[PDB]
C-alpha cells in the first residue's frame, strides 16, 4: 500500500460532480477499519 499524505490519516474523496453521490474514503492501514456487520441480500427486480 501507499502512505497517507504527510500530516494526515486518510483521504476523503469528496464528490464534486455527481450531486447525489455520498463520500468515499481511503485508509492506508488495515488496522483503521473493523468489519462489524455481514449483510446477506439479494438486489430486487424493480416493478
Amino acid at each position: 500500500m501507499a502512505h497517507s499524505p504527510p500530516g494526515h490519516h486518510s483521504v476523503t474523496g469528496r464528490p464534486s460532480v455527481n450531486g447525489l453521490a455520498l463520500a468515499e474514503y481511503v485508509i492506508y492501514r488495515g488496522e483503521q477499519a473493523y468489519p462489524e456487520y455481514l449483510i446477506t441480500y439479494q438486489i430486487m427486480r424493480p416493478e
Binding site: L22, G30, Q32, A33, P35, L38, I39, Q42, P46
Partner: protein, 161 residues
C-alpha cells in the same frame, strides 16, 4: 477467531442497519453495469461479526490517530463490498484488500452509499458477475456486503469527479 451472530428482524439493531443499507441506495453513473439494476434489497440475513483480536487491533490504532488529532478519531460507519468478505471477517483488512488502481492510491476503500460497495461484490467493475449465472444483475444469487467501523483521523480532503 471469528463468530457470526444472526440478528432477528425484530431487533432494533437489525432494523437500523437495514435502514442504512436501504436508505443509501442510489442510482449509479454506469446504469447498473457493475452492480445491477435495483432500487432496494431483499435483506435475507444480518450477522454481527465478533473477533476480539481484530477489534483490539482497531481500537489500538484508533487511540494513536486520536492523540495525533486533538482527541478526535473521526470514526464513521461505512460499507465495503468485495469477493474477499469471507476472508476479511476471519483475518481482518490488509494489503490484499487494497485497490491498487484506486483513484486515491493503493489503499482500502469504503463508501457511504451501500449501492457503491455493491458494485465491487463480484470484483472491480463487478467482475464477470455472479459465479453461477455470470450475471452482474443476478436477482437469484445471494450477495454479501460489510458495514464497517472506520477511523479517518485528519482526512486529506480531495475534491473529485
Amino acid at each position: 477467531g471469528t463468530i457470526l451472530i444472526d440478528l432477528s428482524p425484530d431487533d432494533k439493531e437489525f432494523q437500523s442497519v437495514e435502514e442504512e443499507m436501504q436508505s443509501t441506495v442510489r442510482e449509479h453513473r454506469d446504469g447498473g453495469h457493475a452492480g445491477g439494476i435495483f432500487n432496494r434489497y431483499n435483506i435475507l440475513k444480518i450477522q454481527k461479526v465478533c473477533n476480539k483480536k481484530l477489534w483490539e487491533r482497531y481500537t489500538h490504532r484508533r487511540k494513536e490517530v486520536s492523540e495525533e488529532n486533538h482527541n478526535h478519531a473521526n470514526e464513521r460507519m461505512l460499507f465495503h463490498g468485495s469477493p474477499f468478505v469471507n476472508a476479511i471477517i476471519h483475518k481482518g483488512f490488509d494489503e490484499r484488500h487494497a485497490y491498487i488502481g484506486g483513484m486515491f492510491g493503493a489503499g482500502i476503500y469504503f463508501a457511504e452509499n451501500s449501492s457503491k460497495s455493491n458494485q465491487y461484490v463480484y470484483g472491480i467493475g463487478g467482475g464477470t458477475g455472479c459465479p453461477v449465472h455470470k450475471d452482474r444483475s443476478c436477482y437469484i444469487c445471494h450477495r454479501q456486503l460489510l458495514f464497517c467501523r472506520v477511523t479517518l483521523g485528519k482526512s486529506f480532503l480531495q475534491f473529485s469527479a
